[PDB]
Amino acid sequence: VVDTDINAVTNYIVGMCQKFLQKGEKVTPSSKLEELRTREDRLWDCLDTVEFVLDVEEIFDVTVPDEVADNFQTLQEIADFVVSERAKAG
Numbered sequence: 517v518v519d520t521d522i523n524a525v526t527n528y529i530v531g532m533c534q535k536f537l538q539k540g541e542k543v544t545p546s547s548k549l550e551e552l553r554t555r556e557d558r559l560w561d562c563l564d565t566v567e568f569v570l571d572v573e574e575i576f577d578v579t580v581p582d583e584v585a586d587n588f589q590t591l592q593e594i595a596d597f598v599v600s601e602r603a604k605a606g
Contacts, residue, residue, distance in 0.1 A: 519576055519602040526595040532571060533591055536564060545592035
């Protein structure tokens with residue numbers, strides 16, 4: 517996608533997140549990740565965030581510092597971070 521377009525990046529990241537989830541589970545950009553049920557029929561936890569951040573780093577070519585990753589609670593925040601990093605001059 518256009519990696520500085522928040523709509524496109526957010527839609528993409530929602531799609532990525534859905535692959536982690538139990539069938540029929542609903543996720544929106546404002547959903548608290550920790551309230552979501554994963555394929556393992558358990559609630560999303562710190563491991564899922566670590567894995568998801570790595571997936572995002574791979575696809576969008578951004579570096580997420582641990583301090584940032586440790587404070588993510590929603591997909592909108594992740595999409596916002598991706599766009600902000602890609603949009604930065606230099």
